[PDB]
Design a protein around this ligand. Structure first.
Ligand SMILES: N[C@@H](Cc1c[nH]c2ccccc12)C(=O)O
Ligand SMILES: N[C@@H](Cc1c[nH]c2ccccc12)C(=O)O
Ligand SMILES: N[C@@H](Cc1c[nH]c2ccccc12)C(=O)O
Ligand SMILES: N[C@@H](Cc1c[nH]c2ccccc12)C(=O)O
Ligand SMILES: N[C@@H](Cc1c[nH]c2ccccc12)C(=O)O
Ligand SMILES: N[C@@H](Cc1c[nH]c2ccccc12)C(=O)O
Ligand SMILES: N[C@@H](Cc1c[nH]c2ccccc12)C(=O)O
Ligand SMILES: N[C@@H](Cc1c[nH]c2ccccc12)C(=O)O
Ligand SMILES: N[C@@H](Cc1c[nH]c2ccccc12)C(=O)O
Ligand SMILES: N[C@@H](Cc1c[nH]c2ccccc12)C(=O)O
Ligand SMILES: N[C@@H](Cc1c[nH]c2ccccc12)C(=O)O
Ligand SMILES: N[C@@H](Cc1c[nH]c2ccccc12)C(=O)O
Ligand SMILES: N[C@@H](Cc1c[nH]c2ccccc12)C(=O)O
Ligand SMILES: N[C@@H](Cc1c[nH]c2ccccc12)C(=O)O
Ligand SMILES: N[C@@H](Cc1c[nH]c2ccccc12)C(=O)O
Ligand SMILES: N[C@@H](Cc1c[nH]c2ccccc12)C(=O)O
Ligand SMILES: N[C@@H](Cc1c[nH]c2ccccc12)C(=O)O
Ligand SMILES: N[C@@H](Cc1c[nH]c2ccccc12)C(=O)O
Ligand SMILES: N[C@@H](Cc1c[nH]c2ccccc12)C(=O)O
Ligand SMILES: N[C@@H](Cc1c[nH]c2ccccc12)C(=O)O
Ligand SMILES: N[C@@H](Cc1c[nH]c2ccccc12)C(=O)O
Ligand SMILES: N[C@@H](Cc1c[nH]c2ccccc12)C(=O)O
Ligand SMILES: N[C@@H](Cc1c[nH]c2ccccc12)C(=O)O
Ligand SMILES: N[C@@H](Cc1c[nH]c2ccccc12)C(=O)O
Lengths: 70, 70, 70, 70, 70, 70, 70, 70, 70, 70, 70, 70
């Protein structure tokens, strides 16, 4: 039931899915062009993700901007 | 059980369903003309979606506008 | 247990039910004339819907108006 | 447990029950005269309803008036 | 488990219980004189009700007055 | 687990229990004199009640007064 | 888990337990003198109670005074 | 799992446990001197309690003072 | 899963555990000197406690002070 | 799932774990020096704790200071 | 179902996964360059994580900044 | 499922995991340099932790600063 939203602020965003289990590798990379949105769950096969590029990210904890200086 | 809403702001918005499981591919593409709405769940077969085009997207985290510059 | 409400703002509204499973196709189209309302669930057979025409749409995320310039 | 309330604002309201399952047909039509109220659940046999005529409709998401211009 | 309240504002308010299942019929009629109250559940046998007459009706969505013109 | 409270405002109040199942009839009538209170559950045997007389009635939806001009 | 509290405002309060099941009879009467408090549950054997005399009564729905004029 | 708190305002406050089941009797009496506190649950053996004496009583409904005149 | 907290305001505080079941007796007494704190659960073996001495007592219903003139 | 936090305000704090079951004895003492923190659960083996020394204690019910005069 | 978010404030951030069970060791290290984000769950294999570098960290308890002088 | 956060305010903060079960011992020590963060659960093997050093600690009860004098 846990899910997250990624919106690409610019071209060049990638979302990597990381394998659930003893081993940790990237099993999929989804590219996002500017304006594209991926809505994705954690699943049997995906227990972590890594996001690269200029993006807005939403989870239960709020909205995160990758370009912002905190 | 988790579900999301997509309303097209222009013709040709495209909603791709991504397969649940070890493999990740687009198993379905649903196009939306301006003003059309898709309401869709995550399911046994669909564990992520990719959306392209000028659209309003709603999840339990709130409403996103794909056009908005952050 | 998730349900949605559609009210036709004008004649010509259609609600398509999309099949649950590996196969995705329309299994039903319900036509709504001005003012008519459909209240419908996601179900064993329906895991997504597509709505066409000038309509008010309600989900747990709130009320959408297809005609609104967003 | 999901239920809805319909109050007829005038004579000529009908509430159609739509069959749950692979097939979608109207299995019952209940007529409401002005002032009459139907309170009804979704059930094993009913997974969607269609409402016609001048009516006030209540669900979890609020109260809807079929005659109103949104 | 879902339940509703009906208070008669006049004599001869009538509460019809509608059968759960494939068939839909009135299996019981309970009449209420002015000020009398019925508190009733949905059950194995009752999946909808139809109410006629001047009455106050309460559900988890709030209080409805059958006389009020909207 | 749903329960209701009835307080008699005057002598002459009666609380009828209505049988659960295909058959609907009164299986019990409890008389309340002024000020007396009944607190009762819905149960295996009771799926609806009817209240007659001048009474204060409490459910999870709030407090009703049978004598009130609504 | 459903429970209620009775405090006697004066001598002469009685709390009657009513039998759960097909039959409805008083299986116990507990007398309360002024100031005494009974805290009691609904149970396998008790599905309703009747309270007589001058008392303060508390349930989930609030506090009720038997002597008050509503 | 439901529990209650009793603090004595005077010596000789008395807490009687009432048996769960078909029979209702006091199976235990616990006396409290001024300022002493009992925190007790309802249990397999105890489905009601009777309290006599000047005391503060707390339940999930709030705090009661047995001395207070209403 | 219910727990309680006792802080000794002065030397001489005692917390008695009362046995769960048909038999009710003290199975343990824990002595607390000034400032010492006990945090304890209800359990398979303990269904009530009695607290003696000058103490601050905390439950989900709030904080009590045994020395307070109520 | 029930847990508590202890922070030592000064050297000389001890946290005693009390055995769950028919018998009640201290099965472990953990010493805390000034500034050290113990976060601990209730468990199969621990159903109560006793805390000695100058400490800040946190539970669901709030923060308690052992040195404070209430 | 608990998850956490890590955003790298600068290059050089590392997220170590710590093994669940009797054995505790690092089974994975994910490196994050400036702006990159990891969203990850606790899992069958990971019961703790250690984060090194200049990072924004989000959990259900809120947002932490590793560089902040606390 | 319960989890906690520890951020080091100085080098050499030390987090000791304490064994679940009849025996209580430190089964693991994780040291943190200034700014490093551990996010950790209670588990089958870990039912308490002991933390030494200048640190910010977060639980569902709030944030604690080990340096703060109360
Ligand atoms: N294979 C790892 C992936 C992972 C999840 N959460 C992590 C946190 C840190 C490092 C790796 C992970 C797992 O399922 O446990
Ligand atoms: N429901 C899990 C993810 C998940 C789905 N199927 C699974 C099977 C095994 C392990 C985890 C999962 C979550 O929200 O976090
Ligand atoms: N209920 C899941 C989706 C889902 C439905 N059927 C499934 C079967 C297997 C795995 C996941 C699912 C969710 O809301 O996220
Ligand atoms: N087949 C993948 C699809 C997926 C879900 N969430 C993801 C996040 C990142 C990359 C891929 C995914 C899965 O079910 O796990
Ligand atoms: N047959 C698809 C229908 C579907 C649900 N959600 C979707 C999102 C995108 C595309 C298709 C879908 C399924 O049950 O999984
Ligand atoms: N409750 C499901 C829909 C549903 C009903 N019956 C089903 C049987 C199989 C799969 C899904 C369903 C949902 O909202 O997601
Ligand atoms: N027979 C369909 C009825 C239905 C429910 N929800 C729908 C949404 C759109 C179209 C039809 C429906 C079903 O049970 O799935
Ligand atoms: N409880 C379901 C409706 C329902 C009742 N019985 C059913 C049997 C099968 C499928 C659905 C149902 C709901 O609220 O939505
Ligand atoms: N509990 C259901 C009604 C109900 C009771 N018994 C049933 C048996 C079958 C189907 C429904 C029911 C509700 O609140 O809506
Ligand atoms: N026999 C129908 C009664 C019913 C319930 N909800 C309805 C809505 C519309 C029409 C009929 C109904 C059923 O149990 O499904
Ligand atoms: N015997 C009916 C009693 C009943 C409950 N709710 C009702 C509503 C209307 C009419 C009768 C009823 C039943 O158990 O279903
Ligand atoms: N808990 C049910 C009433 C009830 C108790 N026991 C029952 C046995 C069968 C049917 C209903 C019941 C309700 O409030 O709706
Ligand atoms: N023997 C009845 C007692 C009862 C409970 N609620 C009632 C309401 C009205 C009349 C009687 C009752 C029963 O268990 O069902
Ligand atoms: N737990 C029920 C009462 C109850 C206890 N044991 C029971 C056994 C049978 C029926 C009801 C009960 C309530 O709070 O309402
Ligand atoms: N858990 C019940 C009391 C209880 C405990 N054990 C029981 C065994 C039988 C009946 C009731 C009980 C309550 O909080 O009210
Ligand atoms: N033996 C009775 C005790 C009781 C509980 N609640 C009551 C209310 C009134 C009278 C007696 C009781 C029972 O378990 O049911
Ligand atoms: N042995 C009694 C102890 C008890 C619990 N709650 C009580 C209230 C009053 C008197 C005694 C008790 C029991 O388990 O039931
Ligand atoms: N969780 C129970 C106490 C308890 C723990 N283990 C038990 C075993 C039997 C009876 C009660 C218990 C309560 O708070 O009421
Ligand atoms: N061995 C006791 C310890 C205990 C828990 N709560 C208590 C309260 C008072 C006295 C002792 C205790 C038990 O598990 O029950
Ligand atoms: N989960 C219990 C403690 C506990 C863990 N394992 C247990 C085994 C038996 C009894 C109690 C426990 C609590 O939070 O209170
Ligand atoms: N292997 C340890 C890892 C761990 C989790 N939480 C901890 C807290 C402190 C030290 C180690 C840990 C465990 O699963 O229990
Ligand atoms: N849901 C667990 C993590 C988890 C997933 N699968 C597991 C299998 C075994 C143990 C733990 C897990 C938690 O957050 O604590
Ligand atoms: N879920 C427990 C910890 C836990 C995980 N696996 C366990 C196995 C046995 C006992 C406890 C556990 C908690 O949050 O506190
Ligand atoms: N081995 C102990 C560890 C522990 C948990 N909570 C405690 C509180 C005090 C002392 C020790 C502990 C246990 O699992 O129970």
């Amino acid at each position: 039931s846990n899910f997250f939203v990624i919106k690409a602020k610019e071209n060049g965003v990638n979302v990597f899915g990381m394998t659930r289990g003893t081993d940790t590798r990237f099993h999929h990379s989804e590219k996002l062009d500017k304006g594209e949105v991926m809505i994705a769950q954690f699943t049997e096969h995906t227990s972590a993700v890594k996001i690269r590029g200029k993006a807005i990210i939403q989870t239960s904890y709020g909205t995160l901007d990758t370009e912002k200086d905190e």
